[PDB]
Each structure stands twice: as C-alpha cells, then as structure tokens.
Design a protein around this ligand. Structure first.
Ligand SMILES: Cc1cc2nc3c(=O)[nH]c(=O)nc-3n(C[C@H](O)[C@H](O)[C@H](O)COP(=O)(O)OP(=O)(O)OC[C@H]3O[C@@H](n4cnc5c(N)ncnc54)[C@H](O)[C@@H]3O)c2cc1C
Length: 499
C-alpha cells in the first residue's frame, strides 16, 4: 500500500480514546471564531423554533397556566370556552352571558399549545395475519416517505427545479434503489442512472458542475451482491459501469457524486475512485465527487489520501463531508463480528468533533478539493461558515441538505444578504423514484429524525434551551473528560464487541 492508504487501514478500528484525543485540537475553534459561531448558530436555531412564534406563544400559554393555578387539562378547556365565547357576534351579548350566567371541537388544536388501540391491534392482527402487517408496513412507508421524495421520475423532479434554483439552490438527484441482488437488478439501475444523466445534463444546459445540477450514485446499485463482492469481480464488472456513467456526466459537464455506504465498502470504493481519476477522457475535468463520513475513525486519513489523489491526478475533487447515515447498522454489524472495536464513534458528540476537524482539513486545500458540507445542524453550519474565513467566493465551498429536511434552516442561508440571508449556496439532495425503491432510504430517514441525539429532533424539543442545542462539541468533549477521567471514552451503553 501507499503511505496514505496504509494509514487508512491502520486507523480502521482505532480505540475511541485515542481517536477523539487526536482530533480535539484539530476541531477546536479559536475563541473569537467560536464566539461568532455560537451567536450565528443561536440565531439560526432561534428562527427555526420560533417560526410562527412557537416560543412566544408557549410563553403566554404557561403565563396563564400560572396566574390562575390551572392545570394543563384545565388550560385547554378554558380556551375552548373562550373560543366559543369569541364566536358570539355581538359583544353586549357575549359580555352579558359571561356576567349573568357563567364545545370542545378544536380542543386538540389548543392542546398542541400545551390504551384501547392495543385491543384494536390485537384483534385486527390475529384476524388478518401477516398480509395485514405487510400492507400496513408498505402503506406507512409510502405515507411517511412522500415528504422525502422529489418526484417519481427524473422528468418530474427536474420540472420542479427552477423554483429553488432561481433562489440560488442547486440540486443533486438520487435515483432511489440500492443493494442490487441480481444481475438484472443492477442492469436496471444502470439504465436508470444513464437515463437520469441524459435528463439532468440536458436540463443543466451547460451551467456546469458548480451552478448546475448533478447526480448521486450508489455503487451497491451497480453490482449484484456488492456487500460481499470481491475485488476482481468489482473491477471487471462494476468499474466499466462507473466509468461509463462518469464519461457521460463529463460530456454534459455535470457533477457525478459517489455516495458513501457501509464501512466495509470504503476500501473498494477508494480503489474504484483511484482508477477513475486517471482515465484520460476525464483529464482536466473536476466533476468527480466523493462522499466521506465523519463518523468513521478513518475519515481524516481518507482526507489525506484524497488530497494526495487530487494532486497526483491533477484535478479538484468535489468532496461531500457528511456525518453518516448507517450508524445503527454499523454498531450492530460490529457487535456481531466480535472484532477489537467499532469503525464508527459511539457518542454523537465525537462525530461532531470529527466533522469539524475534517472540515478544517478540507478548507485548507481549495486548489485540490471543493468541499460540500452536508448538514441540517445549525451549529455545524455556523461553525463551517466561520471556519471558511473571510472573503468567501462561490467556488470556495457549498452547503448541502436532504429534500424535506433542509428547507427551514437553509431558507436563512441561501439568498441575498439584503433579504437577511447569509448568501451561501446549498445543494439539495433529491431522491427520485416510486414506492418500490423507497424502503431503505425512508428507514434511514426515520432513524435520523427519530434519534434523540439528532439536531432535528432536539430542536423540536422546546424544553431544551437554545444554548445547549448549539453547544460547542469540543467543549462538550472536554466536559465529559473532566467528569469521567479521560478524553474520548466510549458510550457507556455501547461496550466493545468482545465485552
Ligand atoms: C445532502 C446530504 C447527502 C448525504 N450523503 C450521505 C452518504 O452518501 N452516505 C452517508 O453515510 N451519509 C450521508 N449523509 C448524511 C446522513 O444522511 C445524515 O443526514 C447526517 O449524518 C446527519 O447529520 P446532521 O449534521 O444534519 O445531524 P446531526 O444531528 O448534527 O448529527 C446526526 C448524526 O450523528 C451521527 N450519530 C448519531 N448518533 C451517534 C452516536 N451515538 N455516536 C456517533 N455518531 C452518532 C450519525 O451520523 C447521525 O446521522 C448525507 C447528508 C446530506 C444532507
């Protein structure tokens, strides 16, 4: 192996105390930068919560719960009567009714300001069995998944693009579907990607890899049983498909991004990337993109490799820095394999520290990397904004977000300074497909949105103060270290696989 490739392999399951300790000073924001990041993060998160005055309304709510010593159930019932009184048209009649003599339709809506279904479930199940369960799972998947899908076909998705593109947003389209099980499956995904590139490229119409739309691909869709595939078959079979798609993207001058999937496929994906970057037909073209996952211990070492690869292959790589979408499966996988450790961190704050350290590394080499900072986290965003320094220029970096998750945060970000925005571009990741391709993506979105460690989950918890929500991760790790006795201890509820 090369020097940088060898270092990747060595860090695979590095002990967490060691990995976190090494990243801390790389992630630490200088005090004035940290202060500016905090104020911006606080401001972004405040406007998120208090959209339609959610906090101020909740304030007046509890203020009346106190002054009368009323319950919360006593609060709703009072508003319901108050609402019915405000529907009496003439004030003299309303006043006279209140004085001389003194319904719950919208009681549910008022309660938002403040057991037998189990029987119905046990009854319905035994009667109708697994077919009812299977249809209910398919149905709930489609209902919950709709908010995350931009269109059923690439033509439909593309037809919706101008609305946000004219506001300064960009797109990366994802043809849903992954983990091809058969040769026919992988061939169908290949044809779907080719069709999509033709459509996106014609719509891009020469706007180029920065301003114009691009595509995101999953290597697992292009090779049957990719999860266990050997190097020889992957190079023989998957790589010609990857090359073919990338040459076509180059012909239309659109970005083509290689998504990151499970951690045991990182190595083969670097082998594919290495070969791709030296294709003569791609010389002098900078549209190749690659995702790296900050929750992996290998991430900073992958960056050193990518920096060297951009230098040797004489290109600027588009690098999407993410935290990562497969954490729950990574933990379970590692516990089943009984190895010396985990390839990912076990405390969420460590992943945040890793992301900040990795972001600094990426921003230091603008000639070699175009960083694409994917996050829905207001502190992460504000930190990157400050770390990128003074004198932003559009080609310095961009943000990215997922369709159906990013809008309220990035509405404050993309657009004119005169309109109160930060004037930084954001590329929306846009899944395209029908219900038959949605399951795996939807599940990952449920895990993301439902975890009590996720920013998008914590910002919806109005009992968590804004200052705790946007707390600096480096300081959080040092507070843990002072309490627990050393830096970077694993999650107490996630022991090592061999324990
Ligand atoms: C446009 C875009 C493209 C993306 N592409 C990919 C991709 O190709 N591959 C991929 O794997 N991910 C990808 N992601 C990331 C993934 O889908 C999540 O959106 C992302 O990790 C959420 O980070 P956040 O900063 O918005 O949330 P935050 O809430 O600040 O962080 C949440 C993340 O922390 C991590 N985490 C949660 N619990 C723990 C824990 N106990 N210990 C350690 N870490 C923890 C997980 O990565 C989780 O997603 C992409 C994200 C976006 C926005």
């Amino acid at each position: 192996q090369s020097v940088s490739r060898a270092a990747i392999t060595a860090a695979y399951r590095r002990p967490e105390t060691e990995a976190v300790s090494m990243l801390l000073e790389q992630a630490r924001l200088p005090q004035p930068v940290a202060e500016q990041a905090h104020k911006l993060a606080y401001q972004l998160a405040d406007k998120l919560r208090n959209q339609k005055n959610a906090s101020g309304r909740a304030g007046m709510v509890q203020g009346l719960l106190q002054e009368f010593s009323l319950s919360s159930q006593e609060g709703v019932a009072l508003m319901c009567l108050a609402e019915a009184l405000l529907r009496i048209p003439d004030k003299a009649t309303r006043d006279a009714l209140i004085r001389d003599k003194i319904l719950f339709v919208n009681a549910a809506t008022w309660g938002l300001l403040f057991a037998s279904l189990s029987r119905s479930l046990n009854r319905i199940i035994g009667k109708s069995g697994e077919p009812l369960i299977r249809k209910g799972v398919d149905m709930a998947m489609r209902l919950m998944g709709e908010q995350f899908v931009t269109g059923e076909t690439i033509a439909e998705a593309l037809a919706n693009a101008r609305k946000l593109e004219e506001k300064g947003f960009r797109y990366s389209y994802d043809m849903l579907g992954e983990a091809a099980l058969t040769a026919a499956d992988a061939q169908a995904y290949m044809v779907s990607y080719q069709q999509a590139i033709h459509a996106i490229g014609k719509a891009s119409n020469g706007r180029g890899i920065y301003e114009g739309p691009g595509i995101s691909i999953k290597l697992s869709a292009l090779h049957p049983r990719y999860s266990r595939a050997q190097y020889d078959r992957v190079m023989e079979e998957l790589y010609p498909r990857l090359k073919s798609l990338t040459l076509l993207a180059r012909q239309y001058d659109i970005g083509i991004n290689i998504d990151a999937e499970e951690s045991d496929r990182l190595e083969i994906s670097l082998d594919l990337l290495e070969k791709l970057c030296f294709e003569p037909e791609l010389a002098g073209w900078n549209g190749i993109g690659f995702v790296i996952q900050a929750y992996q211990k290998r991430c900073p070492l992958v960056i050193d490799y990518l920096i060297d690869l951009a230098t040797r292959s004489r290109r600027r790589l588009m690098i999407r820095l993410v935290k990562g979408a497969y954490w729950d499966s990574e933990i379970k996988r590692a516990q089943m394999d009984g190895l010396e450790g985990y390839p990912v961190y076990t405390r969420k704050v460590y992943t945040d520290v890793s992301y900040l350290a990795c972001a600094k590394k990426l921003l230091a080499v603008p000639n070699l990397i175009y960083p694409q900072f994917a996050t829905h986290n207001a502190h992460t965003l504000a930190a990157i904004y400050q770390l990128a320094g003074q004198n932003y220029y559009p080609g310095q970096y961009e943000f990215q977000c997922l369709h159906g998750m990013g809008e309220p945060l990035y509405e404050q970000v993309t657009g004119k300074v005169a309109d109160g925005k930060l004037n930084r571009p954001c590329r929306i990741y846009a899944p395209v497909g029908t219900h038959e391709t949605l399951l795996a993506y939807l599940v990952r979105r449920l895990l993301e949105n439902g975890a009590n460690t996720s920013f998008v989950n914590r910002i919806a918890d109005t009992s968590l103060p804004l200052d705790e929500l946007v707390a600096d991760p480096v300081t959080a790790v040092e507070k843990l270290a002072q309490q627990e006795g050393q830096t970077g201890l694993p999650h107490p509820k996630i022991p090592l696989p061999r324990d």
